[model samples]
Target chain A: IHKKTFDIAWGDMAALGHVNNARYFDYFQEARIDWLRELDITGPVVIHVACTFLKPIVYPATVTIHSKVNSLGNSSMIMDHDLYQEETLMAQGVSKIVWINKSVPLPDIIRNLV
Target chain B: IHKKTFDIAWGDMAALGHVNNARYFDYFQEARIDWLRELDITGPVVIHVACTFLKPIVYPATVTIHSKVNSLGNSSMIMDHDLYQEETLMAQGVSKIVWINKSVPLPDIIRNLV
Candidate 1:
């Protein structure tokens, strides 16, 4: 598992005085891609991700995003993401991705490595 | 009432294959602020906005956002927002805003005008 932390900015707040919910997914994406890059893996990956907001995140709070590969399948992978502020779990998301080679089958290099 | 349109980009999507829900509020903010700017009214505006997502928005779609002032109060205002893709209503939001002059009372200019 890898963790990434981001400081919330004033612009990150919506007119509602809370962090916009959609931005959390962006944070998750950043962490996911960064982790994959660290693993030296690259290819066309299709993601199927979903998130549920548990609580409103106010400004001036630091957010920690944790991500891990939960399962590896023959042609796809599942990743779980948890968002926290200190010890509080603010949101959780799961992403399923299928590794593809161009428009063809899964590359042998990726299939063998994973 | 004013209507604003925006084009969705690939980066706007999440691993979930839909438009990040939070970006809709950002779009609503842009329309609200633009409307306020056009009215030539300025002051400290505190917003209380809430939204419910009715459907998922995919990329390569043009979104049209519609907003209007629903009600006006001595110290606050209510704005209603609706988001659409062509003819589909994807989401709806309502925002409550209090107009104040700095930390003091409501500005006479705004009070009398609104």
Candidate 2:
């Protein structure tokens, strides 16, 4: 699994005094781009993403995002991400990325990296 | 339903030559805030949101976001959003929002506004 850490920012909070739900995907995408950067990939298309929020994360908290390739198919890859603030599992997400037609046959380099 | 328009920006695109999936939420949030502003709501907490990306949106395009209160409950509300580029339905999303402890009862004004 590839992982990265982020300090929850003040702007990240909503009126509930907790992080906005949508920001979790930003954290996930940051890790995704970081990991996929080395594979000469850019502009990867996301077909779908669904997240389940287990707990609310308050700001002034630092969170870690853990991402990994769950499985890969002919032209797409399924990535799973977990967000944690200290000991709390804040959210879980699954994302699917597809290679455009021109980039058919995803690079084998991704398999090794995964 | 409340409607707002936005011109697709260059920065909104990802490396994939189309709008980044995450940016779509920004568009929705912008429209959400505009609608919620007059109601004197701020820092509204989003419990969840799930989106289905239909077609890619190229840059230099202007799109409209349609946001409406889908339903209401004791302390929470459901919002639906549709994004369109020209005649294309780019994406659709649903969001749930909860009022904090002090705001237990959702405003009745919402019903009429919706």
Candidate 3:
């Protein structure tokens, strides 16, 4: 339900001369955090994370991550994140997160968003 | 199959005081690289990567990643990785890699290992 944009930093590139695959997870995490912070939620822990690279992302480019809650459990949720540069999709990510506080009920603010 | 061990660095920890989920992919990548290097393979590109975090890894710990080729295709393969601290499993990862040299067939040595 939200998007976060980031400038590709020099450090984001790997030996392959493109963005490192692992770095995509960081982008997804930040985008998820950006959405959660808006509702004052914190301490979400990702138990599973995945990404499929559709295209290479080189430095000196800006990328945007579109993140939204895909599904929910009593105390967990699956977040879907799509990374794009302009109109081209670069990668897609999915993450399962749960509150570190242990099975805490979903806040109404977030539950309603699903 | 090969295993690589790394000392958890201070910079690997995130705001939550544990290794960030994305960092697990770095370990998996390095382990995969180590195995590929033994066969003198280079320029492999990851198309997909995933990890499931079973437990949090704190600092002052040494972790090991076991990496191996799980399956093979004409020009792509799946790498399986398991991260452990001592004897406890911390995370599991899978990566799909293809040759950046454009559909180069799997090296004979690797194909035989499958």
Q: What DockQ does each prediction reach against the true complex?
A: 0.09, 0.48, 0.88
Highest-scoring model, lDDT? 3
Q: Which stretches of model 3 miss by more than 4 angstroms?
A: A100-102, B100-104
Instruction: Give residue B28's lDDT in candidate 1 (0 to 100).
Output: 73
Clashing pairs in 1: A22-B22, A49-B15, A49-B16
lDDT string, candidate 3, B1-114, tens digits: 688888999999998799988888878877877787787774567889999989899998998998878889977889889989999999999999887536788667878877
Clashing pairs in 3: none
TM-score per prediction, in order, is 0.52, 0.75, 0.92
Tens digits of per-residue lDDT for model 1 on A1-114? Answer: 689988988887878698775576567767877877776763545345556566679989998988876666666677788999999998887766665433345546445444
lDDT of 1 at A100: 46
Model 3, A9: alpha-carbon shift in Å? 0.9
Per-residue lDDT of candidate 2, residues B12-114 (tens digit): 8978598878787777777888888867662346767777787889988999988888888767888989998877889987778777635567666675665
What is the alpha-carbon lDDT for the whole of candidate 3?
A: 0.85
What's chain A's TM-score in each predicted model?
A: 0.84, 0.89, 0.90
Sort by TM-score, best first: what order? Answer: 3, 2, 1
- Specify the highest-DockQ model's number: 3
Q: Give the true-structure RMSD of model 2.
A: 3.9
